[PDB]
Amino acid sequence: PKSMQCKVILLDGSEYTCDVEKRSRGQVLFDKVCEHLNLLEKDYFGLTYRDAENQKNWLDPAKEIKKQVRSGAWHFSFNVKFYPPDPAQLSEDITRYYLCLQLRDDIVSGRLPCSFVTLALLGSYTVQSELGDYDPDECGSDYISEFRFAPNHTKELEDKVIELHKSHRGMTPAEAEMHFLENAKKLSMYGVDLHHAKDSEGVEIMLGVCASGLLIYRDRLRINRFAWPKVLKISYKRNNFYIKIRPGEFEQFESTIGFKLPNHRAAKRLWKVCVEHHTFFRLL
Numbered sequence: 001p002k003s004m005q006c007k008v009i010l011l012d013g014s015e016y017t018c019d020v021e022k023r024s025r026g027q028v029l030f031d032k033v034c035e036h037l038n039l040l041e042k043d044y045f046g047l048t049y050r051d052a053e054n055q056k057n058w059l060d061p062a063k064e065i066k067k068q069v070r071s072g073a074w075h076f077s078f079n080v081k082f083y084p085p086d087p088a089q090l091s092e093d094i095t096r097y098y099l100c101l102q103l104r105d106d107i108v109s110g111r112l113p114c115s116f117v118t119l120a121l122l123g124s125y126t127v128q129s130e131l132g133d134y135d136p137d138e139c140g141s142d143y144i145s146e147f148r149f150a151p152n153h154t155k156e157l158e159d160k161v162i163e164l165h166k167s168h169r170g171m172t173p174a175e176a177e178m179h180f181l182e183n184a185k186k187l188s189m190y191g192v193d194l195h196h197a198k199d200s201e202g203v204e205i206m207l208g209v210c211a212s213g214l215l216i217y218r219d220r221l222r223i224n225r226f227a228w229p230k231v232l233k234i235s236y237k238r239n240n241f242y243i244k245i246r247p248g249e250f251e252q253f254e255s256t257i258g259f260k261l262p263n264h265r266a267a268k269r270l271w272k273v274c275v276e277h278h279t280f281f282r283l284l
């Protein structure tokens with residue numbers, strides 16, 4: 001029974017290696033990674049792989065691994081797939097821990113924009129969680145943390161992390177992680193999966209896919225928001241992505257909004273993430 005070596009980048013940046021039968025479905029590998037991580041609330045998470053074109057794709061747990069990675073290496077990342085709107089409602093601290101690690105990468109990467117003060121506050125909770133109570137013995141007037149807090153680090157940001165860290169004395173790791181999440185969850189790009197697209201006139205837009213629904217970022221003076229309930233139907237054909245929007249009360253007919261994606265694979269990928277978000281956040 002022939003087995004393929006899988007390499008998974010975990011949210012702490014370490015590498016997990018395991019083997020699965022070469023005809024294995026994605027769920028088989030995912031179950032192994034989640035067991036390794038002692039993760040029970042698995043529904044929020046998934047594995048990604050970098051495709052031929054080099055884009056992030058979700059590994060479909062229901063399909064053969066080989067029919068997804070195709071010509072590529074069996075290399076994956078472990079990631080948050082569905083960002084919970086209220087992390088306080090997750091049943092386990094370890095779930096909230098993996099969500100914090102994902103969000104720290106969201107922030108450092110610049111996928112999750114954040115004010116100076118929120119960067120310093122989130123950083124202060126990470127330090128409290130990981131080192132515990134503020135100790136002046138480590139932190140002199142020239143201190144720079146090993147922790148990556150932001151896309152661009154400044155001495156003034158390092159100083160503000162320390163100032164707030166001092167205020168958190170006696171906070172446990174679970175308590176600091178929950179405070180991290182109460183702040184992170186309010187950020188306007190929290191849990192927003194962004195896709196480049198063109199509108200029906202060819203104007204460059206971004207489509208964001210989140211728990212609540214669909215966002216169309218046009219010019220920042222107008223952002224169109226479609227709550228999942230207002231979305232009747234989702235579809236792709238060629239390089240196009242279509243959404244059907246319900247008639248307001250007393251209107252005879254749904255409206256159609258069409259978008260042009262870079263290529264057919266980018267259209268299918270947006271369609272599948274919308275279907276999965278719609279299903280997940282209809283049930284949650």
Ligand SMILES: COCC(=O)Nc1ccccc1
Nearest residue numbers: 210212213214215225226227
């Ligand atoms: C405070 O809400 C921020 C937001 O963008 N909400 C939303 C996003 C997509 C559809 C409907 C609502």
